[PDB]
Design an enzyme around this catalytic site. Structure first.
Site, PDB file in Angstrom:
ATOM      1  N   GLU B  64      47.294  38.838  24.914  1.00 44.37           N
ATOM      2  CA  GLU B  64      48.321  38.135  24.170  1.00 44.37           C
ATOM      3  C   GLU B  64      47.719  36.923  23.466  1.00 44.37           C
ATOM      4  O   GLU B  64      46.757  36.321  23.954  1.00 44.37           O
ATOM      5  CB  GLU B  64      49.453  37.694  25.108  1.00 44.37           C
ATOM      6  CG  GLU B  64      49.028  36.712  26.188  1.00 44.37           C
ATOM      7  CD  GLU B  64      49.298  35.279  25.794  1.00 44.37           C
ATOM      8  OE1 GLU B  64      50.091  35.071  24.854  1.00 44.37           O
ATOM      9  OE2 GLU B  64      48.728  34.363  26.424  1.00 44.37           O
ATOM     10  N   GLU B 247      17.461  33.033  42.427  1.00 46.67           N
ATOM     11  CA  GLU B 247      17.148  32.388  43.699  1.00 46.67           C
ATOM     12  C   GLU B 247      18.419  32.021  44.455  1.00 46.67           C
ATOM     13  O   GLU B 247      18.528  32.261  45.666  1.00 46.67           O
ATOM     14  CB  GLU B 247      16.300  31.144  43.441  1.00 46.67           C
ATOM     15  CG  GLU B 247      15.963  30.327  44.669  1.00 46.67           C
ATOM     16  CD  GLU B 247      15.178  29.076  44.322  1.00 46.67           C
ATOM     17  OE1 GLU B 247      14.906  28.858  43.122  1.00 46.67           O
ATOM     18  OE2 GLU B 247      14.830  28.312  45.247  1.00 46.67           O
TER      19      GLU B 247
HETATM   20 MG   LIG Z   1      48.035  36.600  30.428  1.00 47.21          MG
END
Ligand SMILES: [Mg+2]
Ligand SMILES: CC(=O)O[C@H]1C(=O)[C@@]2(C)[C@H]([C@H](OC(=O)c3ccccc3)[C@]3(O)C[C@H](OC(=O)[C@H](O)[C@@H](NC(=O)c4ccccc4)c4ccccc4)C(C)=C1C3(C)C)[C@]1(OC(C)=O)CO[C@@H]1C[C@@H]2O
Ligand SMILES: CC(=O)O[C@H]1C(=O)[C@@]2(C)[C@H]([C@H](OC(=O)c3ccccc3)[C@]3(O)C[C@H](OC(=O)[C@H](O)[C@@H](NC(=O)c4ccccc4)c4ccccc4)C(C)=C1C3(C)C)[C@]1(OC(C)=O)CO[C@@H]1C[C@@H]2O
Ligand SMILES: Nc1nc2c(ncn2[C@@H]2O[C@H](COP(=O)(O)OP(=O)(O)OP(=O)(O)O)[C@@H](O)[C@H]2O)c(=O)[nH]1
Ligand SMILES: Nc1nc2c(ncn2[C@@H]2O[C@H](COP(=O)(O)OP(=O)(O)O)[C@@H](O)[C@H]2O)c(=O)[nH]1
Ligand SMILES: Nc1nc2c(ncn2[C@@H]2O[C@H](COP(=O)(O)OP(=O)(O)O)[C@@H](O)[C@H]2O)c(=O)[nH]1
Lengths: 426, 430, 120, 426
Positions: B64, B247
C-alpha cells in the site's frame, strides 16, 4: 486508489446518504457548488475515494441515487447539496413500491435495475482502483429492502471480489411506522447474509435513545438520526481517506472483524456524544472516549451487549493522540469485562488511529462491534413475522406480484438459521 | 567494500527505515538532500555518485502506498532513489495469504530487480538487513516470498533478520498470530540470525528509564535504529576489536537452527538522568542482563545463556570489559549453559553513540550493544503457540487464507514447525 | 480411612516440612511458601537435578510472585503431572491460609511417587 | 575505603538525615549543587566515605531515601539541598502507613522493599570497601518503625558482617504526638535488638530540655532538634573521615563499647552547647567540655544516668588539643563519680581525638554512653504498652493487616527480657 462507489436506495437511504455527503463534503472542504474550499492539502489527496475530478477543479461524488418515486429525488435535488450530484445518477421510476418487497424485487424495481446497472458500471469504470460499494438502504418498506437486495445481488454477481458493505436501518417493534415491515426485513436479510461481505445494523429506537438520554435533545428530528448514522458512515472509511499511524481500510476491518463468513451483521457506534450544555464540562481524553464507547447507551440498536458475547470489536480512533493508553483501555475493557467478550478468542479489539480529527473535534472514536447479542433484533423480527405468517395475512399483495409462499418459508427458515449460529457461539 | 543491502517491508519496515536512515545521515554527517558538507565510512551503507551525493542502498516495499508516498513528501523525499522505493496498489489486509501468493506476486519481480541493481555496485557486499513485523500482512507474506528467492539468488550472503514481534498482552490485530506462525518457516530456513522486537517490553523500557510518559512508536524507532547501528558499528568505524558481520553471527550461532538471540541496549537513559551518573562500563554491563531491560517480554533468569556478545562503542577500555565480565560470571543468578564457560564475545568501537536532536535519549560517552541467545526466549513463543491453538481450534479465520490460495494444511505444517523449534530450544539447555 | 481432611493433618504437614533440612530462617511457613521459591527448595532435597534455581527470583511483590508461580506450574508441576487453575494460583500468591496447603498435601505424595518409579 | 551507606526511613528519618547531609556537606565544603568548594585538601581525601565521585568533580551522597508518601520526598527535594540527591534513590509509595507498623512491615512497605533493595545493593557495589550502613528512622508511627525494621533485617541478612548502626528517635509520654506509638516502639525494638550491632536512642523530650535549659532558645523549632541529632551524627563517624591522633572508627567504638552482644542501645551527646549571648563568655577548654559532657542536661534522652551505672562511655574529642588533660578528666569523672560507673569494669571510657575541629569551632566533644539507666525508656514503653495491651484496643488495625496477637505478646516479652538484662548489671 481504493475508489469506493456509493448507492442510495429508498427515501431513508438516499436522505441519510445525502446528509453523509454533506458531512464528508465539509470534512473535505467541498463547496455546495462542488468547488474545493478546504484549508489543508490533507483534504485533497484522497478526493478520488468519494468524488470524481472534473473541469474547473470541481468534484462530483460517486453516488448512484435509486428510488421508485420522483418525490424523494425532488426533495434531495432541492436540498442543501442537491446541485453537486450527477443529473444522470438520478435514476428513478414513477409508481412507488407501496412498501411492497415483491413489487421492488420483481416488478417495479426489475425494470429500473437495467437503468441503475449502466450507471454503476460507468461509475466503476471511471475509477482507477475500485475497492468496494457502500450502499445505504432501509430494511423497512419495499423500496429500500426490495430493490436494494436485487441490485446488491447483481453487483455482487458481476463484482465478486470487491468489498460489499451496507448500512441498513432496520424495523423495530415500538417505533414501527408501517404494518408490513417484518416481511420486508425477513425477505431482505435473506439476501444480505448470502451476498454482503459487510452489513451495519442500525435501529431507529437506539438512535432515539442516544438523542434523548445522551444528547439531551428536546426535539431531535429525523435529520439528527441521519447525522448519527453519517458520523459512523464517515468514521468507518476514515483510514483510507486520511493518513494515520494505524491504517485500517475496509478490508483491514474485514479480515479482523468477521470470524466466520456469515457472522457479518455488526454494531456501529460513535464517540464523543454530549448535550449542548455539557460539552463545556467534559474532558475529551481518550480513556473517557472509551468509557463512553462501550456503553450500552452509545450503540445504535436495541440489542444490549450484556445479553451476549462480543466476537470482535473495532475501535477506529481519530486525532493527534499517542496509543499506549489506547492499548491499555482496549485491554482493560476486555479484561474487567471479560465475561462480556468471548474468552475463547483473546484479543477481540481491532485498533485504528487517524492523525487528523474531525473538523471542530480534537479527537473522535468510532465503534464497530460483533456481539452475539445482535440476535435480539433478528429473533424478534422472526417472531413478529410468525405472528403474521403462520396463518396467511397480507400475502395477496405479494403473491399478486408473482411472489410465492415457499420463498417466505425459506426466508423464515434462514432467519432461524442465522439466530441459531449467533446463539451457538454465545 | 563491506556493503549491506537493507530491505524494508510493510509499514513497520518502511517507517523503521525512515528512523534508521534519519540516524545514519546524522552519524555519518549527510544532509537530508544527500550531500556532504566539509574516509569511506559511508561505503557500508550509502553509495556515492560523481556529483557528491550519498544514495542509500535500501528498498522500501509496501503493498500500500500511504506510508511510502508519505516518505515521498517528507524531508527524505530527495535522499532516496524514488523508484527503489516500491509501492503496490492493494494493501495486504493483515493477511499472509494474499501477501505471499496474490498481491505480492506481481510486485516481487520488481523488488528482486531492484535488489539486483543494488547488488551490482556492491563490491564487498556483507549481508542483508531486512526489517518487518510478524503480525502485519505485508511483513509476513511479502517477506516470506522474498527471503525464498533471496536464499537462492544470494545463498552465500548472510541475511540478518530484524523483526517486530507481538506482545503477550499488547496487540493491534486479532489475526497477528496467524501471520506470525507462517513466518516461522522463513526464519528457520531462509534466515541466518533473527532479532525479535517486542513492543510492550520496550514500552516498559521507555516508561521506566526514559521517564517519558507519552512516547510514540517514533521513540521505539529511535532506539531500534541505535541497536541496528550498534550491530553495524564495527563495519563502518574503527575499533580495537572490530567484529565482522560474519564473525558476529559465527559467535552467536551454536547450531544452524539456534540463531534467535535477544537484544538489549545500554544506557537507555533520559537527558535529565544522564547528568547525575558517571555511567561506567560496569553498570552498562550490569544493566544489560537485568530482566527489566530486555527487548522481549521474557525473563532471562527463567533461562540459560548460550552465547554472549559485548558490542561496546565509545570511550570504553577493554580492561574494564574484562573486569565487568569477571563480575558477570561471578554472580550465580546469571547461569550460562554448560556449553560456554568462555561465555563472552567482546567487541569495542571508537565511535560514541550519535544522538537524535528530537530524540528522548541522552548523550552518553559510552554505549554497549547486547546481543545474546538464551533458552528463556522460548516463552515468547510458548504463549504464541497456545495462542494459535486458541484460534485454530475452530478454524477461526482460515476462510480468508483458504480464499486467497493457501492450503488448509499449511497451518498444520506451521504449528508442527513451531513445535519443532520449541523442542530444539529446550534440549540444548540441558 | 478418613474420607475428609481433619484439623490434625494440617499439623502433621506443618511438622513434616520442618523435619526436612531447608535453608530457611525462623518464620512461619504459610507466609514463606506463598513466595514460591521455597517450594522448589523443598523438592531440591528429593531430586536436586530437576530443580534449577536458575529460574525463579525471590521478591515480595504480587506480580513477581504470580510470575514465578506460573513458571513453576509449567516446569515443576507438569513433570509431576500436577495441574492447578489460575483462580487457585491467585490465592496461593496472596498468602491465603489453607489454599497453598491444599497443594502442599499432594505435592509430597507425588514426589514419593516419582521416587518409587524406576527411572533409567 | 571504609565507605558507609546511608538509608532514610520515615519523615523524621529523611528530614534529619537531610539536615545531616547539609551539615557534613558544609564540613566537607560541598556546594549545594554538589561541586566541591572546601578550603583545605583535608576535606577531600575521605569524600568517598559519604559521597560518590561523578563527572565534573561533583559529588553525590550515598543515601537511599525511603518513604511511603510522596509529600516528604517533595519537601526534601525542594529543601535547601534537595538537588544534590540521586533521583533514583527517591524510592517511595503513594498511600501512607497511617502510623501502622503492620502496614509498613507486611503490606505497604513489603511491596517497596524490592525497590529499595535494588538501590541499596547498587550503592554498596559502587563502594570500594564497605564498612556498614547508618540508618535514620523513627520508632514512632508505622513508616519509620515499620518498614525500617524490615529492610534493616533484609540488609543484615544479606550483609551479615558489616557494621549496623542506627539512630532512632523514639516515643515519649509527655511529648507524644500520636496515640499508637508504644505498639510501634515495641514492634521495632524487637528487631533492633536482634539485628542491629549499634542503636543510638534519641528522645525528643531531652532534645527540648537541651534547647531550653542549655541553649536558651525561645522558639527552637523541629529543625533545631534535627540539628542536635546531626551534631552527634557527624561526630560519631569523625575519625574515619579525618585524621586525628587517636583514630576510632565505628568498629573501634563497637569493640570497646558493647560488653555483651545485646547491650547496644546507647546514649548520645555533644559539646559544647551555649546560648547566643553566653558563648561570648565561656572558656571552651577541654576540662570544661568534659564537665558539660557528662551533665545529665547534655544528654538526648530522659533516662537520667544517676539512676543507673555506666557500662561503657565513648568520648570522641575533636580539635588541636593535647591529651594528658583528656586522660585526667576521663579518669577523674569515673573516679569522683565511681558510684555512677560500674566499678567491676575499671576504665569505662574510650577516648578518641581528631585533629581538625568543626567549622567555626576550635574544639568539640561527642558523647556516647552505655548506662543501665537507659532502661527507663524501655520499661516505660513496656508499661504504656501494657496499658493498651492487656485487654485489646487498636488491634483490629493491625490484625486487619495479617498481624497476630501472639507476636505482640512475644514483642512485649522481649521488651521485658531487655529491661531484665539492663537491670541485671545495674
Ligand atoms: Mg501494511
Ligand atoms: C462547539 C463545540 O465544540 O461543539 C461541537 C461538539 O463537539 C458537539 C456538541 C457535536 C455537535 O453535534 C450535534 O449537535 C449533533 C446533533 C445531532 C446528531 C449528531 C450531532 C456539533 O453540531 C457537531 C460538530 O462536529 C463536527 O463538526 C464533526 O466533524 C462531525 N461533523 C458534523 O457534526 C457536521 C455538522 C454539520 C454539518 C456537517 C457535519 C463529524 C463526526 C464524525 C465524522 C465526521 C464528521 C462539533 C465539533 C460541534 C457541533 C457544531 C455543535 C456532537 O457531534 C459530533 C458528531 O461530534 C454531538 O455530540 C458530539 C460532540 C459534541 O457534543
Ligand atoms: C559565632 C560563634 O562562635 O557561634 C558558633 C557556636 O559555637 C555556637 C553558638 C553553635 C551555633 O549553633 C546553634 O545556634 C545551634 C542551634 C540549634 C541546634 C544546634 C546548634 C552555630 O549556629 C553553629 C556553628 O557550629 C558549626 O558550624 C559546627 O561545625 C557544627 N555545624 C553547624 O552547627 C551547622 C550550622 C549550619 C549549617 C550546617 C552546620 C557541627 C557540629 C558538630 C558536628 C558537625 C558540625 C558555630 C560554630 C556557631 C553558630 C553559627 C552560631 C552551637 O552549635 C554547635 C553545633 O556547635 C550551639 O551551641 C554550640 C556552640 C555555640 O553555642
Ligand atoms: N515496534 C514497532 N512495531 C510496529 C511499528 N509499526 C507497526 N508495528 C507492528 O506491526 C504490527 C502490525 O502490522 P501492520 O501495522 O499491519 O504493518 P504491515 O507489516 O505493513 O502489515 P500490513 O498493513 O497488513 O501490510 C503491529 O502489531 C506492530 O507490532 C512501529 O513503528 N514500531
Ligand atoms: N433512522 C431513520 N429512520 C427512518 C427515517 N425515515 C424513515 N424512517 C423509518 O424507516 C422505515 C423505512 O421504511 P421506508 O424507507 O419508508 O420503506 P421504502 O419506502 O420501501 O424504502 C420507515 O418505516 C420509517 O419509519 C430516517 O430519516 N431515519
Ligand atoms: N526529634 C524529632 N521528632 C520528630 C520530628 N518530627 C516528628 N517527630 C516526632 O517523632 C514521631 C515519629 O513518628 P512518625 O515519624 O511521624 O511516624 P511514621 O510516619 O510512621 O514514620 C512523631 O510522633 C513526631 O511527634 C523531628 O523533626 N524531630
Amino acid at each position: 486508489m481504493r475508489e469506493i462507489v456509493h448507492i442510495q436506495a429508498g427515501q431513508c437511504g438516499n436522505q441519510i446518504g445525502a446528509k453523509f455527503w454533506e458531512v464528508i463534503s465539509d470534512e473535505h472542504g467541498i463547496d455546495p457548488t462542488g468547488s474545493y474550499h478546504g484549508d489543508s492539502d490533507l483534504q485533497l489527496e484522497r478526493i478520488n475515494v468519494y468524488y470524481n475530478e472534473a473541469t474547473g477543479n470541481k468534484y462530483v461524488p460517486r453516488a448512484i441515487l435509486v428510488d421508485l418515486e420522483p418525490g424523494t429525488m425532488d426533495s434531495v435535488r432541492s436540498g442543501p447539496f442537491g446541485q453537486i450530484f450527477r443529473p444522470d445518477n438520478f435514476v428513478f421510476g414513477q409508481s412507488g413500491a407501496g412498501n411492497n418487497w415483491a413489487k421492488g424485487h420483481y416488478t417495479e424495481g426489475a425494470e429500473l435495475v437495467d437503468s441503475v446497472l449502466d450507471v454503476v458500471r460507468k461509475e466503476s469504470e471511471s475509477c482507477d482502483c475500485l475497492q468496494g460499494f457502500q450502499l445505504t438502504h432501509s430494511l423497512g418498506g419495499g423500496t429500500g429492502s426490495g430493490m436494494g437486495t436485487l441490485l446488491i445481488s447483481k453487483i455482487r454477481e458481476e463484482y465478486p471480489d470487491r468489498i460489499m458493505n451496507t448500512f441498513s436501518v432496520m424495523p423495530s417493534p415500538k417505533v414501527s411506522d408501517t404494518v408490513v415491515e417484518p416481511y420486508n426485513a425477513t425477505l431482505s436479510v435473506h439476501q444480505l447474509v448470502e451476498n454482503t461481505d459487510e452489513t451495519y445494523s442500525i435501529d431507529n429506537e437506539a438512535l432515539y435513545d442516544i438523542c434523548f438520554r445522551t444528547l439531551k435533545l428536546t426535539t431531535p428530528t429525523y435529520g439528527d438520526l441521519n447525522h448519527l448514522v453519517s458520523a459512523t458512515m464517515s468514521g468507518v472509511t476514515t483510514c483510507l481517506r486520511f493518513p494515520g499511524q494505524l491504517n485500517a481500510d475496509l478490508r483491514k476491518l474485514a479480515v479482523n472483524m468477521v470470524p466466520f463468513p456469515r457472522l457479518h451483521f455488526f454494531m456501529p457506534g460513535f464517540a464523543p456524544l454530549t448535550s449542548r450544555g455539557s460539552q463545556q464540562y467534559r474532558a475529551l481524553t481518550v480513556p473517557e472516549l472509551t468509557q463512553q464507547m462501550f456503553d450500552s447507551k452509545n450503540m445504535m440498536a436495541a440489542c444490549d451487549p450484556r445479553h451476549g458475547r462480543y466476537l470482535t470489536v473495532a475501535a477506529i480512533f481519530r486525532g493527534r493522540m499517542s496509543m499506549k493508553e489506547v492499548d491499555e483501555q482496549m485491554l482493560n475493557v476486555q479484561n474487567k469485562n471479560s465475561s462480556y467478550f468471548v474468552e475463547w478468542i483473546p484479543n477481540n479489539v481491532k485498533t485504528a488511529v487517524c492523525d487528523i480529527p474531525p473538523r471542530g473535534l480534537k479527537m473522535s472514536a468510532t465503534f464497530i462491534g460483533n456481539s452475539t447479542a445482535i440476535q435480539e433484533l433478528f429473533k424478534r423480527i422472526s417472531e413478529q413475522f410468525t405472528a403474521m405468517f403462520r396463518r396467511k395475512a397480507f400475502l395477496h399483495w405479494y403473491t399478486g406480484e408473482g411472489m410465492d409462499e415457499m420463498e417466505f418459508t425459506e426466508a423464515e427458515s434462514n432467519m432461524n438459521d442465522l439466530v441459531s449460529e449467533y446463539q451457538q457461539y454465545q | 567494500m563491506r556493503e549491506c543491502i537493507s530491505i524494508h517491508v510493510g509499514q513497520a519496515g518502511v517507517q523503521i527505515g525512515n528512523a534508521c536512515w534519519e540516524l545514519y545521515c546524522l552519524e555519518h554527517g549527510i544532509q537530508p538532500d544527500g550531500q556532504m558538507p566539509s574516509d569511506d565510512s559511508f561505503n557500508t551503507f550509502f553509495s556515492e555518485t560523481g556529483a557528491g551525493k550519498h544514495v542509500p542502498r535500501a528498498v522500501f516495499v509496501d503493498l500500500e502506498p500511504t506510508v511510502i508516498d508519505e516518505v515521498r513528501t517528507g524531508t527524505y523525499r530527495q535522499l532516496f532513489h524514488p523508484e527503489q522505493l516500491i509501492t503496490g496498489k492493494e494493501d495486504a489486509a493483515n493477511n499472509y495469504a494474499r501477501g505471499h501468493y496474490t498481491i505480492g506476486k506481481e510486485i516481487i519481480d520488481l523488488v528482486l530487480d531492484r535488489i539486483r541493481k543494488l547488488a551490482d555496485q556492491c563490491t564487498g557486499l556483507q549481508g542483508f538487513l531486512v526489517f518487518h513485523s510478524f503480525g502485519g500482512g505485508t511483513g509476513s507474506g511479502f517477506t516470506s516470498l522474498l527471503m525464498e528467492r533471496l536464499s537462492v539468488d544470494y545463498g552465500k550472503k548472510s541475511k540478518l533478520e530484524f523483526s517486530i514481534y507481538p506482545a503477550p498482552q499488547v496487540s493491534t490485530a486479532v489475526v497477528e498470530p496467524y501471520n506470525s506462525i507462517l513466518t516461522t518457516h522463513t526464519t528457520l530456513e531462509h534466515s541466518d540470525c533473527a532479532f525479535m522486537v517486542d513492543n510492550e517490553a520496550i514500552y516498559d523500557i521507555c516508561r521506566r528509564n526514559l521517564d517519558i510518559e507519552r512516547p510514540t512508536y517514533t521513540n521505539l524507532n529511535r532506539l531500534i535504529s541505535q541497536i541496528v547501528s550498534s550491530i553495524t558499528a564495527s563495519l563502518r568505524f574503527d575499533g580495537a576489536l572490530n567484529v565482522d558481520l560474519t564473525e558476529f553471527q559465527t559467535n552467536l550461532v551454536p547450531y544452524p537452527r539456534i540463531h534467535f538471540p535477544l537484544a538489549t541496549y545500554a544506557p537507555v537513559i533520559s537527558a535529565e538522568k544522564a547528568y547525575h551518573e558517571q555511567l561506567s562500563v560496569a553498570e552498562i554491563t550490569n544493566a544489560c542482563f537485568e530482566p527489566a531491560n530486555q527487548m522481549v517480554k521474557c525473563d532471562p533468569r527463567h533461562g540459560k545463556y548460550m552465547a554472549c556478545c559485548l558490542l561496546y562503542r565509545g570511550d570504553v577500555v577493554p580492561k574494564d570489559v574484562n573486569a565487568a565480565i569477571a563480575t558477570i560470571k561471578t554472580k550465580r543468578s546469571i547461569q550460562f549453559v554448560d556449553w560456554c564457560p568462555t561465555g563472552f564475545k567482546v567487541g569495542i568501537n571508537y565511535q560514541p553513540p550519535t544522538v537524535v536532536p528530537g530524540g528522548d535519549l541522552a548523550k552518553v560517552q559510552r554505549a554497549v550493544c547486547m546481543l545474546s541467545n538464551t533458552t528463556a526466549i522460548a516463552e515468547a513463543w510458548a504463549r504464541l503457540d497456545h495462542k494459535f491453538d486458541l484460534m485454530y481450534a475452530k478454524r477461526a479465520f482460515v476462510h480468508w487464507y483458504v480464499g486467497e490460495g493457501m492450503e488448509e494444511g499449511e497451518f498444520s505444517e506451521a504449528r508442527e514447525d513451531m513445535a519443532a523449534l520449541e523442542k530444539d530450544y529446550e534440549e540444548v539447555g540441558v | 480411612m478418613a474420607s475428609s481432611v481433619d484439623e490434625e493433618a494440617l499439623h502433621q504437614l506443618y511438622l513434616w516440612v520442618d523435619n526436612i533440612p531447608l535453608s530457611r530462617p525462623k518464620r512461619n511457613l504459610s507466609r514463606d511458601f506463598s513466595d514460591g521459591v521455597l517450594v522448589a527448595e523443598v523438592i531440591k532435597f528429593y531430586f536436586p537435578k530437576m530443580v534449577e534455581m536458575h529460574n525463579y527470583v525471590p521478591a515480595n511483590s504480587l506480580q513477581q510472585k504470580l510470575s514465578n508461580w506460573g513458571h513453576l506450574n509449567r516446569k515443576v508441576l507438569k513433570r509431576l503431572n500436577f495441574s492447578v487453575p489460575d483462580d487457585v494460583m491467585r490465592k496461593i500468591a496472596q498468602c491465603a491460609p489453607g489454599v497453598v496447603e491444599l497443594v502442599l498435601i499432594p505435592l509430597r505424595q507425588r514426589l514419593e511417587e516419582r521416587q518409587r518409579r524406576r527411572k533409567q
